[PDB]
């Protein structure tokens, strides 16, 4: 009310309204799902168009050969944060000949987002990210919120009506976690998960976006006719 003019102001109950309004931009964003087994990690994203004449806004971005994310909210902010991750992954490779741990990737994003919530003039990032990766400790899935909070999960979803997929994955937990050494089945579980967040619209060929990374699989994205297999 009187305490939402900027990020540097606390409300009387200890809330940061600008951070909460940034969180609100994610809720308006199109649904995206993340889930993993012990061998692979999968991102599934529902893309959104302006109208029937327009393209479908790309939701998934590659960060390294072993890491990448999906976005929900302000896309330019995702570009800034993904670019930062690309550099951090790259620094680790050039300087230490070391693939950046997915956990460190999360810590780095948390700290970058945090600085924008404590200083005057700046604004919080207006996007949520789901980071998947395969490193020296196996497969990983992270959830980034622009409050700074990063959380490691077996599965999750963010965006509009993400609660449907999140409930589904919570039920399916014991099943999909043991889909080891089978990419197509782990994707099928993710495609079924994102289907619980659909209303009036269904998954088409230029609507669905899937990404996968794993033990013997570099981070690769599937669009167009390559996702027809899963509809």
């Amino acid at each position: 009310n009187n305490y939402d003019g900027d990020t540097v102001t606390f409300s009387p109950t200890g809330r940061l309204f600008q951070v909460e309004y940034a969180l609100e931009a994610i809720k308006q964003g199109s649904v995206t799902v993340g889930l993993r087994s012990n061998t692979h990690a999968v991102l599934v994203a529902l893309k959104r168009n302006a109208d029937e004449l327009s393209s479908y806004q790309k939701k998934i971005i590659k960060c390294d050969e072993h890491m990448g994310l999906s976005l929900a909210g302000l896309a330019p902010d995702a570009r800034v944060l993904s670019n930062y991750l690309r550099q951090q992954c790259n620094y680790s490779s050039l300087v230490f000949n070391r693939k950046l741990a997915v956990e460190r990737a999360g810590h780095l994003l948390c700290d970058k987002a945090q600085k924008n919530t404590q200083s005057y003039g700046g604004r919080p990032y207006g996007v949520g990210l789901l980071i998947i990766g395969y490193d020296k400790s196996g497969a990983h899935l992270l959830e980034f919120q622009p409050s700074g909070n990063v959380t490691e999960l077996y599965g999750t979803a963010i965006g509009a009506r993400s609660q449907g997929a999140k409930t589904y994955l919570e039920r399916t937990l014991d099943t999909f976690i043991k889909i080891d050494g089978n990419p197509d089945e782990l994707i099928k579980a993710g495609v079924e998960a994102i289907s619980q967040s659909l209303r009036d619209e269904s998954l088409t060929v230029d609507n669905l976006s899937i990404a996968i990374v794993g033990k013997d699989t570099p981070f690769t994205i599937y669009d167009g006719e390559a996702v027809a297999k899963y509809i």
């Binding site: 590659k62 690309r86 790259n90 050039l94």
Partner: protein, 111 residues
Amino acid sequence: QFNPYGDNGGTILGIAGEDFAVLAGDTRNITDYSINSRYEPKVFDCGDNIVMSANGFAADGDALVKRFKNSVKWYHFDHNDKKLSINSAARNIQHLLYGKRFFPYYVHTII
């Protein structure tokens, strides 16, 4: 006075055919009259079907190859995984090299 350059010896050779190309190089690495390694490769696969060698001062050679390999990586990121053509790679390497015009990479480069 500190001399930032050295000579690691060796020699390289590139020949082009009709539908192929070779880039060869000996694996010996030296300083003065001593052998450092009998097998230290200096011809590298940089991706996008480009092979590269920067022969002369190995520290500069490795740095340049490292930078170009990284340039290929970012070319993909910035231009929708487009393949870097050999002519585009050549022009890119010119800028890498000339960027250090007043403190040169002490190498002869072939791709």
